[PDB]
């Protein structure tokens, strides 16, 4: 059973346990100690850390579980960093593919991957931003894929 996390009791027991247990280290230093100030900022980083989990689903353990159905009530858990992440490595994959299909036709392609042409590298590094409708427009052009490359026997 996935209780809403702001009212799970054992979750709040983890709040009391980490605030008080971290406060057991705070019982060593004076009021103006930089260590003591660091544990002030650390207690801030525990109460903010637990109040900013108010819309998760911590179950019977008091530990905030997730959901990967795309329920749209839990899209901020997984599917929004899913689309964000696939944008970032569609960037990286598209930059790497575009740079290799640059340096495949140069003078010395073996030298081009040791010593990156930072001119043309930082050309493609930035130019792969609109990769969904650049791969979709190269894929309709018959250029994204290939045909009749290397293979073994059969």
């Amino acid at each position: 059973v996935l209780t809403p996390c702001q009212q799970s009791e054992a979750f709040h027991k983890r709040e009391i346990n980490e605030v008080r247990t971290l406060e057991n280290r705070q019982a060593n230093y004076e009021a103006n100690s930089p260590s003591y100030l660091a544990l002030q900022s650390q207690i801030d980083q525990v109460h903010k850390r637990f109040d900013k989990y108010g819309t998760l689903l911590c179950g019977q353990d008091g530990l905030p579980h997730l959901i990967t159905d795309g329920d749209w009530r839990h899209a901020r858990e997984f599917t929004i960093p899913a689309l964000l992440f696939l944008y970032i490595t569609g960037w990286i994959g598209w930059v790497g593919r575009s740079y290799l299909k640059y340096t495949k036709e140069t003078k010395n392609p073996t030298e081009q991957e040791i010593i990156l042409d930072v001119p043309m590298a930082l050309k493609y590094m930035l130019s792969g931003f609109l990769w969904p409708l650049s791969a979709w427009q190269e894929y309709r052009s018959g250029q994204l894929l290939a045909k009749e490359d290397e293979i073994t026997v059969s």
Binding site: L2, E18, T21, R49, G62, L66, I151, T152, S154
Partner: protein
Amino acid sequence: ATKFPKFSQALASDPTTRRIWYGIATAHDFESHDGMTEENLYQKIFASHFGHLAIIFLWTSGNLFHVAWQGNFEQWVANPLKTKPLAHAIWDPHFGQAALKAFTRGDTVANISYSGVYHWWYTIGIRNNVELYTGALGLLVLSAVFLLAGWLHIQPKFKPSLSWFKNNESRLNHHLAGLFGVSSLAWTGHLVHVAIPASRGQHVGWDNFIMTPPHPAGLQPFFTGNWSVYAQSPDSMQHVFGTSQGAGTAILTFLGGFHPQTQSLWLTDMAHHHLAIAVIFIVAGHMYRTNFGIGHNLKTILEAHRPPSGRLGKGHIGIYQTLTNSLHFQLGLALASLSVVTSLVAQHMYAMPPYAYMAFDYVTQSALYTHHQYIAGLLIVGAFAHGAIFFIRDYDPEQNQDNVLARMLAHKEAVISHLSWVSLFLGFHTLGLYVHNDVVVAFGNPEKQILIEPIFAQWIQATSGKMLYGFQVLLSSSTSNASVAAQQLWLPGWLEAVNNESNSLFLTIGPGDFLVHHAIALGLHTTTLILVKGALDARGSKLMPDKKDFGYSFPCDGPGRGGTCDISAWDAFYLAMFWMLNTIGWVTFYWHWKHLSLWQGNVAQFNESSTYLMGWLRDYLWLNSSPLINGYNPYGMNSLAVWSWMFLFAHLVWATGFMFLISWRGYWQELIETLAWAHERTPLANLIRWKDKPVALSIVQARLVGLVHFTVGYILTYAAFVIASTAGKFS
């Protein structure tokens, strides 16, 4: 024939010690002998099948005899919860005095039989030692029958013709009907006549099984189809297994679910079960033609399945030829199907425990599952190993002209690239999440973990009535179509077993299920990356396309072209055996640490401390090896001192494997020359000269023997830890 390898003259000319090792390891390789053609091959594997079966029935007569003679079986029948099931007795002359006090259970000093055998023999209806003796003689006779046949079908005019072996057509008419259909029907003839009355108190031994019908009225007014009388009065609630109290008299009642008391399946359910499976298999026996001619020609069944869509090559035309002529294809399908059957057995022996007073002894249930999982992985790896033997020594791409198989070898690059993709993805997304959860838990904060609820398994448990999640779908919702559709038939006896948290059926699920089941799928996809790699690149790769010429387990190609350590199709075996032991590793560590949380009771001990890796190495390996590694102390010992010894022993097996796996031959081949120099040069021993010349082990054998010590060390270590762990926390 002249010396040793009475079968290969390519090894009898060898003067080294390789004639011994390769004389052993190529003994059963019947396809590569001196002059053994096809009829001389099937007429040898057919006899050796009988020798094998007689070894099996000699073994089961072994268990029947030791339980009959050294076990405590009927005393166990008296109190199946209390008394531990005893195995065979001990005769050590090494147990000095203090060991014997750590094994006496009565007059016997026997081992405790952690193999679930008394449970299955107790649900069969064996309630004496006398029936065990008559059964043990009843299988010595059967092993003499099978040795008689294997000796008998190697007698020359009784060696059957190969056209009989190529009656591939009709074995399926007889295995599905006779072996599977009749015998399971015959097994209902046990369960109806023995297990039901000897569970309902009636001692129906071999006397009154024709005078006491299992139903009080039977078979003269019962060809009329009044079959609801056989499911009239079930055994409802107030019954203990073995007596006659609180029990009805119906035979084939399908209640569904468990006993209330013994937490096992009803034997009425198994009688009706094997009866229905029996009828359906006997129906499936009428499938193919014979001398009669009412059935299916298999050529007409693989020829007809060529799609007009055209995507699937020129169809299966070519497959029926390469099953008759092949054997490693047929053995690959055999080990594939038997292996998935074993994993199904393992995934149901704990989940639906069939045997009364199992899931009450928490060691035998923990050994049967792990047993059938390691045997499951061994037989999958056999299916792919003989897959690669099929693609090398048995594959003809001219009879398989652009066949489905030749299509497989065409797109094997996409197959291996995508297996490597999913294996890479799961390996960065189990290990990523376990190192995330383990760093984060390590940094004073179990809360900042990534825990993903495995909602798909929770939803599938909601489809089978587990109401503890709140999805309210087909069976968890009590008003749906399937919920009303079997409301009288088998649901209310079964949802009690589902919604209960005592039994091991449809377990409660945290994110440890998520992260582990992704780790398991990592193991399956890595292990099929290897096996499907060196089964599809078994024949020829762009490193060396000569691979089909060298056979299966050729060593290498030398240092040429960069270096060629382990290119063969035998490497895929050799590496996916490590991945087999690993993957079945994680399966059985996960199962065993799930049930050491259920059986202890603290499920929160699992679900709080299994989402990261020090939960495993802390809460499971460091803690549950404590009654193991206290098996003997400098204060004394106990009964676990065998396993705690074996444990250590098995580590010494395992690491000796590394001596063969890491450090290869040419070290030792120039060290044996120092040993043979020192033996030749010394006095008093240069008389005793070798006959076979001392030679270090060849690099297929060496990787094989290092693999064998890796398996024996692995499996003996974990068989020590399952049994010593659960037998230390209990019994």
